[PDB]
Give the backbone structure.
Amino acid sequence: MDTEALANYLLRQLSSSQEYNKKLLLACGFQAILRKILLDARTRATAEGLREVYPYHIEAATQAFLDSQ
Amino acid sequence: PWEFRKVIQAEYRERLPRNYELKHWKKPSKIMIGSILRLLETNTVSALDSVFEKYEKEMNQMTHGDNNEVKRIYSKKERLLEIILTKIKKKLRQAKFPSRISERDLDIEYIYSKRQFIQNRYSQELQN
Amino acid sequence: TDTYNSISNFIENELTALLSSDDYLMDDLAGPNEVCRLLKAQVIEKRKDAMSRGKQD
Amino acid sequence: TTIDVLSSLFINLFENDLIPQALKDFNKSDDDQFRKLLYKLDLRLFQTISDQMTRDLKDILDINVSNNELCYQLKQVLARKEDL
Amino acid sequence: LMKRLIEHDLNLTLNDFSSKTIPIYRLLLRANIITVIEGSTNPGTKYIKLIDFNETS
Amino acid sequence: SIKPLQIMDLKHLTRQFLNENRIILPKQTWSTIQEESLNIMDFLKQKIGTLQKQELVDSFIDMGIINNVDDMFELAHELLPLELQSRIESYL
């Protein structure tokens, strides 16, 4: 499932070429949010020592992220 | 106070934190207008029913039992309420609010029915 | 049986809606208008987080 | 805050534009009862509409959070039922 | 800049690239033939060099 | 339903990122991030409703992700195929 499929998801959520580029940049930003959140989740899991992450880890990470945003 | 945009901007600046960037201002879409007019129509119907039930005796003694004048004034106040509804519709059509609100996000009947259903399920689970 | 819906429905019908309607009608019929609107304003003001659905629940 | 600014808009509009206008109309019509009680029931209409606006918006927000709280209570009840 | 890249200059960074050479650097980055690593001694300065095209490890 | 995404969509989306950088996701974490994708999309649409040139890069600077347009088309380099990042570079 490519990034263009996520752009299709976003356009069907909101419903030419320049708006396609805008939505593609939006999909890239969404992937950046997910990657940063998962990186914070691993950082906190390694801080606690657990090999995997858990829902409370990533909930705390995303609350700390949205606190700054 | 008829200047809706200034009050909207002042209340958005007052009721939000200072780091909340309101960069994007959007006019209310047609579904917002439909939901607002539906809520206003239902609440005006309920209000006029309550008023005419509460003040029926003075209305009857002043008209000496003439129900035709009662219905004529009911129609006149209905016309006035519809005129005011069109006026406030025109005033909100020149307004700004984020487009995150849908029809299901603002409707009394749907949320009330959902609350009734979840309360019935809660009581049934408590019974079991 | 269904005791909990009966309790909650009895509260939300005969306890808060009846109280609001009776207070409004009695304040309207006490005399007058501006007096009633103002008094309703502060009694609504000080009853915050007390008549909410969380409190009845 | 969108519900809050909508409530503030309705409060300002009814409390400063329509209710004082109909109150002045009610005070003006001293010669004839018939227009006088017309303006009085107009005051009834606008004031009940303003109160209904505020109560309905606060009730929308309150039921929107109370439904989540009741859902949490329902999940707790289901867990206790499973353990039982 | 190309001569510094071929000779594998260790002082190459993003500072010597002008605004006109920014599309050229983007073309080079799209080739995936350069290492983009931020300097530990000077954060914010991305040290740039080509990957080794001759190794037989 | 129609607006929430699926679990397999998230596997196909971020499976390689959890593989190159070693991440282990149990099923509860998968359901949690499936729930969180909706909140992230709502927050992104609340922050950016309409799309024009300067506001998106200003918001992404405000997002704390980037510092310039160079970071924009370098982050697009690591998240897009070659034709799409070339098209974005032609757009920026």
